[PDB]
């Protein structure tokens, strides 16, 4: 009956106890840190395939192949080396929203408007890939997939769930159930082990893959956080929001570090993720160019701009070699 | 290049080829996204003319598919851009719940919310204003000030409904970009799937004569 | 499963013509590079024909150049080899064999029965060591030397080894002298480098004897090793 102002008193506490642990205004430390200068990416490669809007990508292990889905009922897998495609896999619900790519490279997860994040099977006999599972269940709509193992996958879906899969028996084996609104993006940890899950309720909350419990919540942002992805070390992680804001969020801190906002910056993030050291952070912007944000001092060090579109997607490569820029265009570039 | 590296690239052209003849065949379907208010009447349309449910139909050589999204509750604004360059958008209003609970005013909202969309700026529009036999005999009991306070005219179904039509069509802020078709669903007849063929034909022939660079 | 069957064989009388037809069941054939290998009657495999996916590209040995045909009816699954003016060298089993070319994929991965046919500047693949026996239990180390770097640009060095077992048909081992087939024993690991090759075979056992074939895929068209007879 009056049990929400103890809520209230237990978030005030939280908020103290995440303030009372705040003094060092990070920029205060990387102040004496030289800058990275200016780096200037030019497109080596151009994959051109597609005759739709590319809504997701994933690099292989391998960091040569990469799969990326489209709304023309096909998601290719692309040989970034050659501009080569290894695969044309025709998928049955034309309207895809993510794709993701298993470790070892055997299986490839499709998924869209359809509540059915549909995992196909490369690596088999007889040539042609087959649909190995349609993981049904979700009453939302798939938003992202991400592969644990060959066996396990973890899918964020638009009915304020995300879902701990099992490909064998096809059945949801951990249901993590904290948002209020639609879960727009999801990624996993480098030990894979404990993920987070970008909401429309402006708060990224911690999750465990183990046990099922949401373990912190950080809130800051004030619209729709369309991207997240990890710090390599997997002990922070960037959120792409509406607002023109991406934030360092640390999860031993509890609370944000640092925002990435620029004033001339107006438009929505679709996807943020780190180069392999962690330095600079990728950005991908509706101002049709995905800026490059220095992850220590807030300052913006190069643009990506050669997209027509708005940029869906935004890959960097396990070995940091290069990154791969989705947009609307049907094409998606291989900066480096 | 080596031996393999050739028959790769062979591989690659070839699926391309397939790629793109798939494309060629897909692209000459007329897709029409089906919007509508919860209980509008959807069926009845959806039914006639025959998550995500797609219905294909044809129709004087052309084939039309309905993707009727009323079947899924998530934000709207998170998924409604992935239906832009649809042909239209068969937007049925259900007309006999003006009495309902003020349900034409959520019907209403949502149309103006839907047709003054950044991405629905120049997609043509089909209303259904179904359910006219029941609006005809509500009108008897429930005089149509229940609904609109602002009401000056007969208390009749053929002026009530056109009256319910100019106040839909005066909703879109844009006149001179997307068109508002009209139609009153026929029960008993297949002139609803005529009137959608119409439609369609003239927002094709309107965005193929642009195409064509006279207009 | 997987399943290649050739039928056109018999006695064929010199210069007259045959044709050999390999009806492919259980795969998507549309897809397939499918090959014609041929086996004298006591020697090692040879290469003779290739037709590509969609029928866009066609190869021969320099034996057959213009001598033979090879065709392929994707909507049948079937593939024919029409061959005219039969010499007396032509005498042998034909076994026709897939093989699918992207990357990472193991061609020459299945091979048909064959059906034996009687009658009445390319890479020299030097398998130096023709016979060895062997006890089971041990590991043996057969050699594979080539004639020409094989070493590409891309990394790989395109060189395939096949095991024939005694009355059966040549399997895939290991293809690009690194990677292990598919549905292979662990024993089987490939090593050296460019113009020198090794199949260090480990705790050696039974079933496991027959004769290995070093087979170079750099160039057309392909020339097999000599083979190498493990005699238990």
């Known amino acids: 009956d009056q049990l929400r102002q103890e809520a209230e008193q237990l978030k005030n506490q939280i908020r103290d106890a995440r303030k009372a642990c705040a003094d060092a205004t990070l920029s205060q430390i990387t102040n004496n840190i030289d800058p990275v200068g200016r780096i200037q990416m030019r497109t080596r490669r151009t994959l051109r395939g597609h005759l739709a809007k590319i809504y997701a990508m994933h690099w292989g292990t391998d960091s040569r192949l990469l799969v990326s889905a489209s709304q023309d009922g096909k998601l290719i897998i692309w040989d970034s080396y050659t501009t080569n495609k290894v695969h044309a896999i025709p998928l049955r619900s034309s309207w895809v929203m993510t794709c993701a790519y298993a470790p070892s490279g055997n299986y490839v997860a499709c998924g869209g408007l359809d509540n059915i994040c549909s995992i196909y099977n490369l690596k088999t006999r007889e040539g042609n890939v087959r649909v190995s599972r349609e993981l049904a269940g979700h009453t939302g709509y798939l938003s992202c997939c991400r592969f644990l193992d060959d066996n396990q996958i973890v899918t964020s879906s638009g009915d304020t769930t995300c879902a701990l899969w099992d490909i064998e028996t096809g059945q949801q084996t951990t249901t993590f159930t904290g948002h209020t609104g639609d879960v727009m993006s999801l990624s996993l940890a480098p030990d894979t082990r404990l993920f987070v899950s970008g909401a429309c309720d402006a708060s990224a909350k911690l999750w465990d893959v183990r046990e099922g419990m949401c373990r912190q919540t950080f809130t800051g942002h004030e619209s729709d956080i369309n991207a997240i992805c990890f710090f390599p070390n997997g002990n922070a992680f960037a959120t792409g929001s509406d607002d023109a804001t991406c934030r360092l969020f640390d999860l031993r801190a509890d609370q944000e570090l640092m925002t990435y906002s620029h004033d001339n910056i107006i438009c929505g993030i679709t996807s943020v993720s780190f180069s392999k050291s962690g330095r600079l952070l990728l950005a991908g912007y509706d101002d049709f160019n995905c800026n490059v944000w220095d992850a220590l001092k807030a300052d913006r060090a190069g643009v990506l701009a050669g997209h027509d579109n708005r940029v869906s997607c935004l890959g960097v490569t396990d070995d940091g070699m290069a990154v791969a820029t989705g947009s609307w265009d049907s094409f998606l570039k291989i900066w480096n | 290049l080596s031996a393999e590296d050739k028959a790769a690239v062979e591989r690659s052209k070839m699926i391309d080829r397939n790629l793109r003849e798939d494309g060629e065949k897909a692209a000459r379907e007329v897709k029409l996204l089906l919007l509508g208010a919860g209980e509008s009447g959807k069926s009845t349309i959806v039914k006639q003319m025959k998550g995500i449910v797609e219905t294909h139909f044809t129709f004087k050589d052309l084939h039309f598919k309905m993707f009727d999204v009323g079947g899924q509750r998530s934000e709207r604004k998170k998924w409604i851009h992935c239906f832009e360059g649809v042909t239209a958008i068969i937007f049925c209003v259900a007309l006999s719940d003006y009495d309902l609970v003020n349900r034409m005013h959520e019907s209403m909202k949502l149309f103006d919310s839907i047709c003054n969309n950044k991405w629905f700026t120049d997609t043509s529009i089909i209303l259904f204003l179904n359910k006219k036999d029941l609006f005809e005999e509500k009108i008897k009991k429930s005089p149509l000030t229940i609904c609109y306070p602002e009401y000056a005219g007969s208390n009749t179904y053929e002026e009530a409904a056109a009256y319910i039509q100019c106040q839909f069509e005066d909703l879109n802020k844009r006149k001179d970009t997307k068109e508002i078709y009209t139609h009153f669903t026929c029960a008993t007849d297949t002139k609803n799937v005529q009137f959608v063929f119409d439609a369609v034909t003239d927002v094709i022939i309107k965005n193929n004569l642009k195409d064509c660079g006279l207009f | 499963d997987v399943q290649l069957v050739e039928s056109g064989g018999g006695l064929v009388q010199p210069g007259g013509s045959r044709k050999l037809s390999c009806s492919a069941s259980?795969?998507?054939?549309?897809?397939?590079?499918m090959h014609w290998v041929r086996q004298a009657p006591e020697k090692g495999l040879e290469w003779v024909a290739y037709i590509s996916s969609g029928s866009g590209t066609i190869y021969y040995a320099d034996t057959v150049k213009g001598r033979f045909t090879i065709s392929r009816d994707d909507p049948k699954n079937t593939l024919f080899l029409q061959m005219t003016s039969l010499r007396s060298e032509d005498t042998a089993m034909y076994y026709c064999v897939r093989s699918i070319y992207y990357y990472g994929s193991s061609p020459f991965d299945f091979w048909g029965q064959g059906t034996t046919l009687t009658v009445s500047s390319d890479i020299v693949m030097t398998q130096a060591t023709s016979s060895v026996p062997v006890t089971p239990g041990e590991s043996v180390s057969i050699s594979c030397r080539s004639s020409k770097s094989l070493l590409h640009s891309n990394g790989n060095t395109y060189l395939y080894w096949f095991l024939q077992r005694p009355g059966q048909s040549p399997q895939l081992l290991i293809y690009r002298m690194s990677n292990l087939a598919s549905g292979v024993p662990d024993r089987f690991s490939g090593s050296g480098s460019g113009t020198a090759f090794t199949l260090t075979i480990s705790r050696l056992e039974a079933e496991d004897v027959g004769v290995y074939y070093c087979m170079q895929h750099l160039e057309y068209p392909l020339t097999f090793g000599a083979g190498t007879k493990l005699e238990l």
């Open positions: 259980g795969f998507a054939f549309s897809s397939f590079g």
